[PDB]
Design a protein around this nucleic acid. Structure first.
Ligand SMILES: Cn1cc(C(=O)NCc2ccc(Cl)cc2)c(=O)c2cc(CN3CCOCC3)ccc21
Length: 1044
DNA sequence: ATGGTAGGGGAAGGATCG
DNA sequence: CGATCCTTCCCCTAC
């Protein structure tokens, strides 16, 4: 009969816009080859492979790429008698769509589904595979969104006193909509129960009557919540139908192994006829939710496919050496490397090269690959950009990669390709996902927006995992160029590339373009290696399984949604309903440290998950809070509730036995689950142990996300009172721990009394025990008069004692570290030597990946000497012997001599050429869209605008920009004045390392030495009563005066 | 659309004091 | 009236 849901992906083509560089035409004179052919053409798209040629949209007998498709434009490319009986199947992503009965009356669906979607019905499509390998999509009918409204509030506001009345008013309001989107919608299209529920906010709140309204269309529910009755609180109206399908059917997950089973009236699932399919899948199914169950024994992934891909493009305009622009039809996409792996076997299965202008890959590359057990690359030759891109999209649709990865493919690759396919070549994308049409293929940028905080890529049925963000979150670097990341993680350096070199390599011919192919394939291989080292798919799938959210929203839609979903589950379970809404509170207090170098033993105590344990112990929650005394005036204070003053206002938190905290329950259950699964790591195969580790990681993530979720003003379900109470309780606890240690163990008598272990630990000097440092949940205590022999093993017992004697469970204080020497520099900045010989650096420019590697190495060597050299340590002790104030006129002790040496060596490396300029590059992140800036006079901003004027690589909206500092010259000052006049010395001397190396520009030698001295001053002011000016002065005594 | 409060220190520019 | 400070913004940390 034909398809029931029109396939919008191109299966036929007879005429297209042809664009291709004239440089590829050899029979043309070497003079008439500069430009780029552009114009309409009327021939069928074709692709060349190995001397043979075939139409791009030709599918069947002989193909160049692998194909996992069945339907292709109303053709059933499946061997007749293909009726695989499906029992179990794995699910990775979930679609939420609308289906009308009038549309589907052609399809021979059962009566049940047509009743489910009679005017319009929401359908939940589970996508995945069978164990055999078949692509499968099961459609779940019956899922209905629903939201609550107070009955006492609605009855009197809308002059109605019955649920059918509410249905009538809703239908009417939807009729007189702006655009008459819903015309003919009537009251019988809605269901309205009356049910007793409780608002989650505040203990005083008592149950009441709410109208529960069931809605079949996300559009209708959205319009209702937006402008139905704005003066009435609406509950859970944002909950999408997928979340309802997950939570209302207990046991279900968003990622895992399901099984078809018999249903309510002995109902069985029904398989769809091929012409009714709506996916690029081999078999599809219709079923209600009771036809589904979970399968337990199943634990391993199925044969999901992962396409890793990178692209490379070239300009076409007057300047072919400038960076391309996808909006200009002259700049084209020259090459696309695309390699497909199997995710269950982490093995590479196919490698493909899409190229404009046929080529032969270099032989060193081919030899390395074929020797590394990898498959033989297959090159696809194209004459135009349209044919190449169409073939790439046809590959995406036919092979149907369930997962897709690359590097910086969110800000460059996908936007470039899709801008080409959309703005220039005019191609619809709604069918090139998993759905045959009407799908999702959008790409979000930041731009001049306020609400958005992250770039996203969402493709239905296609999980995009950009390894860029993965590395940015998991690894700490100064720059994230793919080759730098490769060398830093895998210790495998590979060739760099720039657009400045691409046109030449293209013009020389098929071999110098096969070089470009080699570079793209090497990039893609490196990305694949990173992917399967960090295993982001398993991590994020475990998070999705835990939070009841699909993999896509797991990745790109924030953290608040996960905590919100779990809390929604628990609150609906326990009788609440979440109301829809839409520097806040005092944080922690860092213990004012008395700075300096400490050589006596230091002990480090800290709390295990301080904020979650506070929430657990004190029963903090939305439902246990109250702002009014009369609410808690009927129970005994202290024994039944906790009175506390937070932010100049009294708060009451009813204790556990009155009303149990929802947050406490979530945290306790998550913690017990984490402990259970971690107890299985030993007696488990490493294959299983990787999954177990990802699981426990996800659990810890959500646990640490609880408090943050509570503290997001104007977020979803916010309650800053809880966050401020948590921080205040933590501050109080730290203060109390300090005072207890001070008062109870001032005398060594008591230290011996409680622990008969300080006998074999009494040091020469006098006994003292005083808190020296503290931050949020940490305590560093000085132990003059004790030996650092078993200070760890006795501080363990100490912390256990303090926890037992001071705090309610599950609050726990542990002894983690004991330092031999420690440098208290300033607030939240310190460096120390652990008793185990390992160094510890926090806060200082050392860890701050914004500085140049040279000053980093130098200051490192300095501190290394300060800790791993006995003479300079005794020298610091000598500096301590005296107040340091007199030393502006006194001499520095001999030990410090070493410093001078290293310092002067610095100067050498600064001015002496043949040094690496990359060893001298600064980095800085570009936070916002530059138009929204308050100073507008920043180094990386100068470099940004300069790169923009030079038609260079415009940095993506949130990367790190590298730069260097020029010295003042005639050209520098002249161009400064010229640019100033055009727009109409301070740190304007900032330049791209690239431009400033090929133009032979010289660095500001004075600046880098002055900042080496500044970093030294900042790091070593501690040893001189923390005075900066005095430290700079007496540091001048390590530098020849001809440099001051 | 959907990520918290503390911090220190560097760059840039205005205000202030003798 | 000229350095000295004093504000503000911005980077990236530690919890
Ligand atoms: C790494 N990190 C990120 C955070 C964050 O992103 N908050 C915003 C937010 C908002 C909504 C959601 Cl859903 C999720 C997250 C933190 O808040 C944070 C806090 C601590 C304090 N620690 C923790 C426990 O005991 C006391 C000391 C330590 C590390 C932290």
């Amino acid at each position: 009969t034909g398809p029931t849901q029109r396939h919008t992906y191109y299966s036929e083509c007879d005429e297209f816009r042809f664009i291709a560089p004239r440089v590829l035409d050899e029979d043309a004179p070497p003079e008439k080859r500069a430009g780029v052919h552009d114009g309409h053409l009327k021939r069928a798209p074709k692709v060349y492979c190995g001397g043979d040629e075939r139409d791009v949209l030709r599918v069947g007998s002989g193909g160049f790429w692998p194909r996992r498709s069945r339907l292709w434009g109303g053709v059933d490319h499946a061997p007749a008698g293909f009726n695989p009986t499906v029992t179990v199947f794995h699910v990775y992503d979930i679609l939420e769509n609308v289906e009308h009965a009038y549309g589907m009356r052609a399809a021979q669906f059962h009566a049940r589904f047509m009743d489910a979607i009679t005017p319009t019905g929401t359908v939940i499509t589970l996508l995945g595979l069978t164990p055999e390998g078949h692509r499968v999509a099961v459609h779940v009918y019956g899922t209905r969104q629903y939201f609550y409204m107070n009955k006492e509030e609605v009855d009197r506001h809308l002059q109605c006193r019955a649920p059918r009345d509410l249905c009538e008013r809703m239908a009417a309001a939807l009729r007189e909509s702006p655009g008459a989107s819903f015309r003919g919608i009537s009251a019988d299209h809605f269901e309205a129960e009356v049910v007793e529920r409780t608002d989650v906010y505040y203990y005083e709140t008592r149950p009441a009557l709410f109208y529960r309204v069931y809605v079949r269309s996300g559009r209708v529910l959205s319009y209702l919540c937006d402008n139905f009755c704005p003066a009435i609180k609406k509950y859970e109206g944002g909950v999408d139908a997928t979340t309802r399908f997950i939570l209302d059917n207990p046991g279900f997950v968003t990622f895992g192994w399901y099984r078809l089973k018999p249903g309510r009236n002995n109902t069985l699932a029904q398989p769809r006829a091929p012409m009714a399919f709506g996916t690029s899948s081999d078999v599809e199914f219709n079923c209600t939710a009771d036809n589904l169950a979970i399968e337990g024994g199943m634990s391993d992934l199925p044969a999901y496919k992962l396409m890793c891909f990178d692209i490379a493009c070239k300009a076409g305009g007057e300047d072919e050496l400038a960076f391309p622009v996808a909006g200009h039809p002259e700049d084209l996409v020259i090459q696309i490397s695309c390699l497909l792996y199997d995710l269950s076997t982490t093995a590479l299965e196919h490698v493909l090269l899409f190229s404009l202008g046929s080529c032969d890959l270099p032989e060193s590359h081919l030899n390395e690959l074929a020797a590394r057990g990898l498959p033989t690359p297959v090159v696809l030759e194209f004459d135009s950009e349209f044919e190449m891109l169409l073939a790439f999209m046809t590959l995406v649709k036919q092979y149907g990669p369930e997962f897709v990865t690359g590097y910086n493919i969110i800000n460059f690759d996908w936007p470039f390709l899709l801008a080409k396919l959309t703005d220039i070549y005019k191609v619809p994308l709604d069918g090139y996902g998993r759905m045959n049409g009407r799908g999702v293929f959008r790409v979000w940028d930041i731009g001049q927006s306020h609400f958005q905080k992250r770039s996203k890529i969402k493709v239905n049925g296609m999980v995009n995992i950009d390894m860029y963000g993965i590395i940015t979150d998991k690894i700490k670097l100064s720059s994230y160029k793919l080759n730098a990341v490769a060398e830093a993680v895998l210790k495998d350096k590979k060739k760099d590339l720039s657009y400045r070199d691409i046109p030449a390599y293209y013009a020389a011919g098929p071999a110098q373009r096969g070089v470009i192919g080699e570079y793209c394939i090497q990039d893609s291989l490196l990305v694949g290696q990173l992917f399967f080292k960090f295993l982001p798919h398993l991590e994020l799938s475990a998070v999705a399984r835990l939070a009841g959210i699909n993999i896509t929203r797991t990745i790109y839609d924030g953290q608040q949604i996960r905590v919100f979903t779990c809390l929604l589950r628990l609150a609906d379970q326990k009788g609440f309903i979440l109301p829809d809404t839409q520097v806040g509170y005092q944080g922690a207090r860092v213990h004012d440290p008395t700075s300096g170098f400490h050589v006596n033993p230091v002990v480090g105590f800290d709390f295990a998950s301080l904020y979650p344990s506070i929430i657990q112990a004190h029963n903090l929650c939305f439902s246990t809070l109250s702002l009014r005394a009369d609410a808690v005036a009927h129970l005994e204070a202290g024994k039944d509730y906790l009175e506390i003053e937070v932010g100049g206002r009294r708060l009451f938190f009813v204790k556990a036995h009155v009303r149990e905290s929802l947050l406490s329950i979530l945290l306790r259950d998550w913690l017990a689950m984490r402990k259970q699964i971690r107890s299985r790591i030993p007696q488990s195969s490493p294959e299983e142990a990787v999954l177990l580790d990802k699981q426990q990681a996800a659990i810890k993530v959500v646990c640490n996300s609880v408090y943050g979720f509570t503290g997001v003003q104007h977020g979803l379900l916010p309650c800053l009172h809880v966050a401020a109470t948590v921080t205040t309780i933590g501050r109080e606890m730290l203060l109390a721990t300090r005072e207890y240690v001070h008062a109870r163990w001032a005398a060594f008598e008591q230290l011996l009394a409680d622990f008969p272990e300080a006998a074999d630990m009494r040091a020469p000097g006098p006994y003292s025990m005083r808190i020296i440092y503290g931050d949020t949940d940490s305590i560093f205590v000085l132990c003059r008069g004790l030996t650092a022999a078993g200070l760890t093993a006795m501080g363990d017992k100490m912390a256990s004692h303090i926890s037992r004697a001071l705090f309610l469970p599950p609050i726990k204080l542990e002894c983690e570290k004991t330092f031999t020497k420690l440098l208290l520099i300033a607030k939240k900045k310190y460096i120390g030597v652990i008793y185990g010989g390992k160094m510890l650096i926090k806060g200082v420019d050392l860890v701050r990946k914004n500085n140049c590697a040279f000053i980093n190495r130098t200051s490192r060597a300095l501190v290394d000497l300060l800790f791993y050299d006995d003479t300079v340590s005794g020298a610091a002790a000598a500096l301590a012997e005296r107040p340091a104030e007199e030393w502006l006129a006194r001499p520095l002790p001999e030990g410090l001599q070493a410093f001078g040496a290293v310092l002067v060596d610095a100067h050498r490396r600064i001015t002496d050429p043949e040094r690496d300029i990359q060893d001298f590059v600064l980095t800085a992140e570009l936070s916002r869209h530059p138009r929204a800036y308050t100073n507008k006079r920043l180094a990386h901003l100068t470099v940004y605008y300069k790169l923009m004027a030079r038609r260079a690589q415009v940095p993506s909206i949130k990367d790190r920009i590298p730069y260097v500092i020029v010295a003042q010259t005639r050209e520098v000052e002249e161009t400064v004045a010229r640019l100033a006049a055009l727009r109409e010395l301070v740190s304007e001397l900032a330049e791209d390392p690239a431009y400033a190396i090929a133009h032979g520009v010289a660095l500001n030698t004075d600046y880098y030495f002055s900042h080496l001295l500044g970093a030294a001053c900042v790091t070593f002011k501690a040893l001189f009563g923390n005075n900066a000016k005095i430290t700079e002065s007496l540091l001048k005594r390590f530098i020849p005066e001809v440099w001051h």
